[PDB]
Design a protein around this ligand. Structure first.
Ligand SMILES: Nc1ncnc2c1ncn2[C@@H]1O[C@H](COP(=O)(O)OP(=O)(O)O)[C@@H](O)[C@H]1O
Ligand SMILES: Nc1ncnc2c1ncn2[C@@H]1O[C@H](COP(=O)(O)OP(=O)(O)O)[C@@H](O)[C@H]1O
Ligand SMILES: [Mg+2]
Ligand SMILES: [Mg+2]
Lengths: 47, 50, 469, 50, 469
């Protein structure tokens, strides 16, 4: 039972790592886009 | 915006005995979003108050 | 005549037009008048940029509420000057050099300009002498430097002001030289508390206080650090005796420069900061230094915005320092004080050649145990302390006891806990932490290590719990 | 829009039409390109507000 | 000559020049003519900004495809006006007030401007009367207010429109007053569906429908809510009998305002919304209110962009409501309908002084159990329920049964599942959830709590699965 349960928990942690990495890459891209929006907004306000 | 909130809140003070000894206590309220206590205006106001 | 004329007024930034041949130099102080009786004053305007066509963009040091476009602007012919000499000790000054303690005091002193070049490279020499404080965590993991640069990093509300007041208590009270404190864009309640507390401790007579607080416009918050730095530079270069410089939230200086950046016509940098962030920080931080034979021990509080240590401002402040004590809100939330992060803090003199083999070895073992505990915390949270090795459980117990023994009852924190403070010598600190690392106190509970002094307090609090060292 | 007009002409004549848009994601990206080249301020994911 | 002249056409925004002294006020309607016989029409332009040099920037309510520069613009001298009175009940209107059901109808009615000021502060009064719907989760955790403001937040496809239709079915059918529906930037197919469904249910004779839908220029989608609100305000102020107001996606009003602001050449705020976001939202929402003795029960759907509840539009909408039902995609994926988030939803009358001590206690215990279940989702996600304490296993089983029992077979859901809807009285809901929290149904399987009504349905489904209450 412990072997089966640990295989299950390993698969679950794998799927959780995958979903969390997807969310982290989304947040990374969003941060870069938002920072560029602020920089270009300031530069266009000054132009 | 920091200057806005900081000059608003710095006028809440305990005066000296020569100035009457009066007081102005301040309770600013800040609404965070998704528990993000580390946003712009939240972190501005947290560093102003006592 | 040679007078100017206000043309544009946009908040703290004022444009002024002068006649040909009478354009003021960069950084000159100019005087304008506000005659509205409720706000009558004399505005000081620092020339920031030469705009062309005889225009000049200046930053105001007072609020421009009530300023009329077209009024006369007088060029004083020099930069902002502050009083210097032995007479500034014992008094509270403005960013302009006006005494608040006693208005009119120092008007006839010698006056130095607040704008200087740093010392020449052939005058600098590395400082590697340990400054002992009495705090276990600072003495062990981030030993301070005599005549070196020390910083307190931290987010909003962790320990910075309490820790810098603690260091004013520990280092500046029995000190034999001059102290200069710069309140830079901080709270006025804390400035008044510091003034009163230095007055009672009979240490104000050796201290010069320069305050520009949060309620000031960004020009004052930009220039107050330069004013206090000029006083400290006079005490270093002319009097020549052992200055102590405290700057509360040097970050505010930087922040002030970003409040006027876009109004000065500068395209914004990455995280909303001015493009000249590192350059202004460098031209300021390189004057805060010891030359050969002329010591300035500096201690700065550095605000870490939004607890993000990757923020550009603290990330570029990091490179100007000899010792950095880094305070975490994660340590703060656990109730450990001072809320020092032992794994993120550093010191350049934490070296076997400076502090000794035993000091260095004990520090390294403490750091290794705390790092292993940080690595195991996630497993302990999810799977529990039971699925760890016997060696790992031993290390976790030792690490909890170590991280609680790094805390201390501080002299400046009695107002928060009611318990008086403690001073621990560095040899006692090293020996106690060597015993903790070897495991000589694995039977004492986790408490009785919390907010105590040395080994005698450890014994007392352990026996008050029913234990024996 | 060209395909939709070709389809709508038939629809209004009483006919039954089925239109397929292989990718509206690529049309959205092309419109985002056109709007950024017109210097219009973008929004979420740098996409136009419209 | 007092007519205008088209100077610029930037999409649906038009610049119009007028003679000096004949500049129309803000919000005034103007008429231009498109004569391209394939697209021939009369454009209604709403004055938005005074640009200077006798120029005016207006927003068009019709698409400007085919508008030439220099054409004549006629100032009507007043704002957009909609028909009001009893005659608007049973009919469908534009944002301009044109009857789509029967063109030409209501042209001789009284006409009211769609730009009103909100009621004076002295005429406002708090509403704390519970509106019982018959939904378990709504009646228990977010009780609605008679004469108050209810909103349904949700992402794409979580069931906001089905819940609006459910609330129409429940409240507006047995309703003794007037109902107004505003389709704002939604599907036209849904407008046709609602028209036919209200005609079949004999409710249309009491309802006034105003539609500005997805295929309209942003001016129409920005002003249709104002038109429907003007009709509702007539029914409130000039008759005083219990108005109902349903607004599908006020977020589409916000989004159309953002598009217009971009077209008007304004500086964008964060994300990309207009700088006047909260100001427009407040101007619109403060008119949607009950005054003293005059009731309007509001019911708005609020779209949440990209499932982001921190988006500025829903975030600024949150502060205008007395009851908020938040629909989660996490709840929606489990199949629970309505997909209400019990921990994020709220109501201002969930207070012992309004609903009672037993209602409040049962609701608080349900919320505590669900919060404790949510705090364990990581451990349960990796390891399952087998590692928890006995307290936590018991709580997790009770919480699973509680979260399935908050679902319900709705009357609006019969078009999807063929299963009829159920109504549960709030006393029965309180009793049932009390018995669930105490653990009276710990033996009943997780199913048999799913999509049912009261305790009788629970018993029947439990014994159809094999258990007994
Ligand atoms: N060593 C300490 N012991 C007990 N309490 C402390 C200690 N350091 C800080 N605190 C508490 O935490 C707060 C931190 O304030 P402070 O560190 O001065 O703020 P900042 O870091 O923003 O200057 C203090 O008000 C105090 O109540
Ligand atoms: N109570 C329900 N029971 C069953 N299916 C539902 C229920 N509510 C919504 N749905 C399904 O989800 C869809 C949600 O549509 P809609 O309410 O327009 O979504 P939105 O939340 O974007 O407004 C329905 O068309 C239907 O397919
Ligand atoms: Mg501080
Ligand atoms: Mg919908």
């Amino acid at each position: 039972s412990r072997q089966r349960a640990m295989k299950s928990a390993t698969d679950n942690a794998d799927d959780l790592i995958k979903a969390l990495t997807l969310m982290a890459n989304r947040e990374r891209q969003a941060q870069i886009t938002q920072e560029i929006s602020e920089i270009v907004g300031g530069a266009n306000a000054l132009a | 915006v920091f200057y806005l909130h900081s000059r608003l809140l710095e006028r809440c003070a305990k005066l000296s005995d020569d100035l009457g000894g009066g007081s102005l206590t301040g309770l600013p309220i800040i609404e965070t979003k998704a528990n993000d206590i580390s946003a712009y205006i939240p972190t501005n106001v947290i560093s102003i108050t006592d | 005549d040679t007078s100017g004329r206000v043309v544009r007024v946009t908040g703290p930034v004022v444009d002024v037009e002068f006649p040909r041949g009478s354009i003021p130099e960069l950084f000159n102080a100019l005087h304008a008048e506000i005659t509205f009786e409720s706000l009558a004053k004399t505005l000081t305007l620092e020339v920031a940029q030469h705009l062309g066509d005889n225009l000049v963009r200046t930053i105001s040091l007072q609020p421009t509420d009530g300023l009329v476009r077209g009024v006369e602007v007088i060029d004083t012919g020099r930069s902002i000057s502050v009083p210097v000499g032995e007479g500034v000790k014992g008094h509270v000054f403005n960013a302009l050099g006006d005494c608040l303690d006693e208005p009119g005091y120092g008007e006839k002193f010698e006056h130095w300009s607040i704008h200087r070049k740093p010392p020449a490279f052939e005058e600098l020499e590395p400082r590697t002498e340990m400054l002992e404080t009495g705090l276990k965590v600072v003495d062990l993991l981030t030993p301070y430097v005599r005549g070196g640069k020390i910083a307190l990093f931290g987010g909003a509300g962790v320990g910075k002001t309490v820790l810098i007041q603690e260091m004013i208590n520990r280092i500046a009270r029995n000190f034999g030289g001059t102290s200069v404190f710069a309140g830079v864009g901080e709270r006025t309640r804390e400035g008044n508390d510091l003034w009163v507390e230095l007055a009672e401790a009979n240490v104000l007579k050796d201290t010069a206080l320069v305050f520009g607080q949060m309620d000031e416009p960004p020009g004052t918050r930009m220039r107050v650090a330069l004013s206090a730095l000029t006083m400290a530079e006079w005490f270093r270069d002319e009097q020549g005796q052992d200055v102590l410089l405290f700057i509360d939230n040097i970050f505010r200086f930087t922040q002030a420069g970003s409040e006027v950046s876009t109004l000065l016509g500068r395209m914004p940098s990455a995280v909303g900061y001015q493009p000249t962030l590192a350059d202004e920080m460098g031209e300021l931080q390189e004057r805060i230094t010891s030359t050969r034979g002329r010591s300035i021990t500096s201690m700065q509080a550095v605000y870490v915005p939004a607890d993000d240590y990757t923020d550009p401002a603290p990330a570029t402040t990091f490179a100007h320092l000899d010792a950095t004590t880094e305070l975490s809100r994660a340590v703060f939330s656990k109730g450990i004080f001072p809320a020092v992060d032992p794994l993120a803090s550093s010191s350049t003199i934490l070296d076997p050649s400076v502090v000794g083999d035993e000091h260095y070895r004990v520090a390294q073992e403490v750091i290794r145990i705390l790092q292993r505990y940080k690595d195991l915390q996630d497993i302990i949270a999810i799977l529990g302390i039971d699925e760890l090795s016997e060696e790992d459980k031993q290390l976790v117990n030792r690490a909890r006891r170590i991280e609680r023994f790094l805390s201390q009852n501080m002299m400046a924190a009695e107002q928060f806990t009611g318990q008086p403070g403690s001073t621990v010598p560095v040899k006692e600190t090293i020996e106690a932490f060597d015993r903790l690392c070897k495991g000589d106190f694995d039977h004492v509970p986790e408490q009785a290590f919390f907010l105590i002094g040395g080994l005698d307090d450890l014994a007392k609090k352990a026996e008050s719990l029913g234990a024996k060292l | 829009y060209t395909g939709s007009a070709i389809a709508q002409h038939w629809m209004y004549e009483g006919k039954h039409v089925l239109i397929i848009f292989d990718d509206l994601t690529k049309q959205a990206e092309a419109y985002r390109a056109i709007s950024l080249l017109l210097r219009r301020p973008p929004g979420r994911e740098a996409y136009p507000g419209d």
